[PDB]
Design an enzyme around this catalytic site. Sequence first.
Site, PDB file in Angstrom:
ATOM      1  N   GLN A  27      25.041 -32.630 -37.746  1.00  0.00           N
ATOM      2  CA  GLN A  27      24.237 -33.853 -37.869  1.00  0.00           C
ATOM      3  C   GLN A  27      22.902 -33.649 -38.595  1.00  0.00           C
ATOM      4  O   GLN A  27      22.277 -34.621 -39.036  1.00  0.00           O
ATOM      5  CB  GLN A  27      24.008 -34.513 -36.500  1.00  0.00           C
ATOM      6  CG  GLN A  27      22.990 -33.818 -35.582  1.00  0.00           C
ATOM      7  CD  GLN A  27      22.944 -34.433 -34.194  1.00  0.00           C
ATOM      8  OE1 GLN A  27      23.788 -34.148 -33.348  1.00  0.00           O
ATOM      9  NE2 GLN A  27      21.954 -35.282 -33.957  1.00  0.00           N
ATOM     10  N   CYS A  51      24.006 -38.192 -33.401  1.00  0.00           N
ATOM     11  CA  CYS A  51      25.070 -37.547 -32.605  1.00  0.00           C
ATOM     12  C   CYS A  51      26.068 -38.578 -32.097  1.00  0.00           C
ATOM     13  O   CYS A  51      27.265 -38.312 -32.046  1.00  0.00           O
ATOM     14  CB  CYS A  51      24.486 -36.770 -31.421  1.00  0.00           C
ATOM     15  SG  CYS A  51      23.173 -37.664 -30.519  1.00  0.00           S
ATOM     16  N   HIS A  72      22.135 -36.917 -25.614  1.00  0.00           N
ATOM     17  CA  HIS A  72      22.849 -36.366 -26.757  1.00  0.00           C
ATOM     18  C   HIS A  72      24.356 -36.544 -26.593  1.00  0.00           C
ATOM     19  O   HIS A  72      24.942 -36.130 -25.594  1.00  0.00           O
ATOM     20  CB  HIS A  72      22.477 -34.888 -26.932  1.00  0.00           C
ATOM     21  CG  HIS A  72      23.172 -34.214 -28.070  1.00  0.00           C
ATOM     22  ND1 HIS A  72      22.749 -34.326 -29.379  1.00  0.00           N
ATOM     23  CD2 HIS A  72      24.243 -33.389 -28.093  1.00  0.00           C
ATOM     24  CE1 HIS A  72      23.543 -33.621 -30.160  1.00  0.00           C
ATOM     25  NE2 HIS A  72      24.457 -33.038 -29.406  1.00  0.00           N
ATOM     26  N   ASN A 127      30.364 -30.072 -30.346  1.00  0.00           N
ATOM     27  CA  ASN A 127      29.022 -30.503 -30.711  1.00  0.00           C
ATOM     28  C   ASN A 127      28.896 -30.712 -32.227  1.00  0.00           C
ATOM     29  O   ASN A 127      29.782 -30.317 -32.988  1.00  0.00           O
ATOM     30  CB  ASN A 127      27.976 -29.505 -30.201  1.00  0.00           C
ATOM     31  CG  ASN A 127      26.632 -30.163 -29.877  1.00  0.00           C
ATOM     32  OD1 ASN A 127      26.368 -31.306 -30.267  1.00  0.00           O
ATOM     33  ND2 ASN A 127      25.784 -29.442 -29.154  1.00  0.00           N
TER      34      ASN A 127
END
Length: 220
Positions: free
Chosen positions: A19, A25, A162, A182
């Site tokens: 990102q 995110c 997040h 992630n």
Amino acid sequence: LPDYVDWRSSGAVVDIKDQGQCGSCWAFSTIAAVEGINKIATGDLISLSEQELVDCGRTQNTRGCDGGFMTDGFQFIINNGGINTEANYPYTAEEGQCNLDLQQEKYVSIDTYENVPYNNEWALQTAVAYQPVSVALEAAGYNFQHYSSGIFTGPCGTAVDHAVTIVGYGTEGGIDYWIVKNSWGTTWGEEGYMRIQRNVGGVGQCGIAKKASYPVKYYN
């Protein structure tokens, strides 16, 4: 339910993305989940456009690099009748004008989305057994940020700050874990992934079970 689930092992997960310097995110989580259900329903893995959501999916709540919500992510794709690919509408890690030409280009679609009943790891496991699931967790703390290997057991708060994507779960050495994709690139964690403790109850580890959702495709 199965004892082990790993959507990567069956080609339902696109390579790890980054990102960058942008709080998008939420869009990466939306996309990874949409990418996963598309593979599951259609047999094809296609990498899809985060930038499209950043530029074109702004709401009162969802604000490009200033954070947002996966439910607005899914909603945009439903209302738009689909989403363009990563290659056609590439990621810039900054807020740009919505490219309407590229917005008209639709390669993947979803029919609906659902929320996992909150604070329910069992319901979360049930959904993960079927597909990757969009989640938010508390990722701001030193330990989470410096995680490189093993099963993360904290410390972390429970404030969702997040978004990530659950792409599986398992047990090793008697410790249950979720597999988390992630969007901090491959140099974070276990090549961009984290194993995080599962079956702790309540809101889940780092609040992972608080705001889980996933996209729906009617036909397989």
